[PDB]
Amino acid sequence: MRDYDEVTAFLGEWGPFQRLIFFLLSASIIPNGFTGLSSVFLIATPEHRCRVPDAANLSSAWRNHTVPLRLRDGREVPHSCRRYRLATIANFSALGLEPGRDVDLGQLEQESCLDGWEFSQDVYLSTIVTEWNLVCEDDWKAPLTISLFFVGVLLGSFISGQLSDRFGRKNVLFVTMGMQTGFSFLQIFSKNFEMFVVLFVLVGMGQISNYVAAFVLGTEILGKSVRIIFSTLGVCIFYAFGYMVLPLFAYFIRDWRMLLVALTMPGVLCVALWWFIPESPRWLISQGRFEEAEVIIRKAAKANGIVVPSTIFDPSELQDLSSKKQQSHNILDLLRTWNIRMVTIMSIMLWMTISVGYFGLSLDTPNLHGDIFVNCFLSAMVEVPAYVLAWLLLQYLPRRYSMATALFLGGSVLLFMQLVPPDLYYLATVLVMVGKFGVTAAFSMVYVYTAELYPTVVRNMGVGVSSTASRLGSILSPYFVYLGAYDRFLPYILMGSLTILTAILTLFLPESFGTPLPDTIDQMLRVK
Numbered sequence: 001m002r003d004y005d006e007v008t009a010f011l012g013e014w015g016p017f018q019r020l021i022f023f024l025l026s027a028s029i030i031p032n033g034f035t036g037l038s039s040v041f042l043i044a045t046p047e048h049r050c051r052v053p054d055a056a057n058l059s060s061a062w063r064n065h066t067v068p069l070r071l072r073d074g075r076e077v078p079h080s081c082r083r084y085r086l087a088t089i090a091n092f093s094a095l096g097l098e099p100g101r102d103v104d105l106g107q108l109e110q111e112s113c114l115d116g117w118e119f120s121q122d123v124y125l126s127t128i129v130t131e132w133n134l135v136c137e138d139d140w141k142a143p144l145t146i147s148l149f150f151v152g153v154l155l156g157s158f159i160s161g162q163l164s165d166r167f168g169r170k171n172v173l174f175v176t177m178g179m180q181t182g183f184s185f186l187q188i189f190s191k192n193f194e195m196f197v198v199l200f201v202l203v204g205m206g207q208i209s210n211y212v213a214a215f216v217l218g219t220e221i222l223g224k225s226v227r228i229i230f231s232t233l234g235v236c237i238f239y240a241f242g243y244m245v246l247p248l249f250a251y252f253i254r255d256w257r258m259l260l261v262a263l264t265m266p267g268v269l270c271v272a273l274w275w276f277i278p279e280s281p282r283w284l285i286s287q288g289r290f291e292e293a294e295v296i297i298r299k300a301a302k303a304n305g306i307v308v309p310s311t312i313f314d315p316s317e318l319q320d321l322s323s324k325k326q327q328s329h330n331i332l333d334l335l336r337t338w339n340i341r342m343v344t345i346m347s348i349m350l351w352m353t354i355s356v357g358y359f360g361l362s363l364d365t366p367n368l369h370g371d372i373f374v375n376c377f378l379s380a381m382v383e384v385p386a387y388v389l390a391w392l393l394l395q396y397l398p399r400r401y402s403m404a405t406a407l408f409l410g411g412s413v414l415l416f417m418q419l420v421p422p423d424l425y426y427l428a429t430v431l432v433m434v435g436k437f438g439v440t441a442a443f444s445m446v447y448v449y450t451a452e453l454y455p456t457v458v459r460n461m462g463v464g465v466s467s468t469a470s471r472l473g474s475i476l477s478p479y480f481v482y483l484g485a486y487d488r489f490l491p492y493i494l495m496g497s498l499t500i501l502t503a504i505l506t507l508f509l510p511e512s513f514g515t516p517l518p519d520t521i522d523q524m525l526r527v528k
């Protein structure tokens, strides 16, 4: 018996086949870039105030003084959820009385907006918040939709695995790509809020599912050395490109339906890949469909120009491949021994906190100062050097000090936010981008570090548990942004404190660099 990576080693590590597969599977990750964080523009809240119908016979003075003024940022602004009793105002205006001259505005009665709201159109022409008035007593519905999107992503994480195992990688990939694109398109025709919410849940489910299927198919087709590069840089950078191009679209298109059309179109464009990506030969061998694997291997050999006679490859060996011992599935293994128990708890908390920080910072961009589109672009762009640095650090430096430093930077920088004087408000944006830089580096590194910490017997299970923890964290991530209304800096204080505690935690994990990866739990490294 032999190994699949050995039997197939004759194809080489790099060449026309593996190159095309690498850049096509990576290109299929772009739509997840602008689909993941489109909520920053689809669910944005413009400035708004109570609407006063023009039927009111109010003087120009009264029309200038129809809403109480409240102070924000040290500056007067119309109160966004309350107005002076329109009937009392109309009675005063009919009597000839005028504000200030005859009326003390400070003691008038107030009511909520019974004629709806007037949203400004300086930035957004329309969004779902303006469509269904998700403001004042409905404001909690705005982040809820985003939480529900990540809820769908959670469910997709469970389902896409089993589906891909039972029906293949390419089939699940393209089916869920089409599902995501179709439900993204359908959302344009949402009559009311509930249909939009449920369609957004399904869109997130499809998005996660097809990301996962692309990742698994790529890490199964590519060779041993290029596998790491694909997993680490290949998909991350093209996700960053998708995110970076999201604000480019949102700048020209400022209507949520036309923006959904624009973000839907690339998904339809990706369907051409069906004729270029083959099914994973390793999976087909797992199902016992050896003729299809043989055909795909011979086609790859022909594409790379390698002569493949019986002396260098034969299906008889293909039919007698080795199978690795099956890994434990019962979760009890992760809790049976004290050391692995503690390592699992720390990894859960580390992944959840890194995810909360990353998605909170991503979703908080429209609340920063300066141009919203420039801020979103800078947020998307600061990830590419974060991935390059993460990759170099993983290649050459111990994981513990690297991740302690990246988290310490990401957390400490945020705590400085409250110390920036308003005159130099732009420094706060600098800090926030450096903050997200650190978080992004840590987020890229943990995917590898955790996979090294667990022994083979349960490695996948442990990684999956920690990954689910991170995904749970992003359900909470839009609510930390929601807290920005109660107190501007509270979200950053929370994120910074939690990140510093996570950076302190990381130092207690055992070091893996430069040591053989363990095979059985008895060989697992001990926590400090």
Ligand SMILES: CC(C)[N@+]1(C)[C@@H]2CC[C@H]1C[C@@H](OC(=O)[C@@H](CO)c1ccccc1)C2
Pocket (backbone or CB within 6 Å): 032, 035, 036, 037, 153, 207, 208, 211, 235, 236, 239, 440, 443, 444
């Ligand atoms: C930060 C880098 C390493 N990622 C490529 C990792 C973690 C975040 C980012 C994107 C990806 O994680 C996701 O969950 C993706 C695809 O499901 C996602 C992006 C945006 C919204 C929801 C999910 C995997």
Ligand code: NA
Pocket (backbone or CB within 6 Å): 028, 029, 030, 031, 032, 177, 210, 211, 214
């Ligand atoms: Na995709």
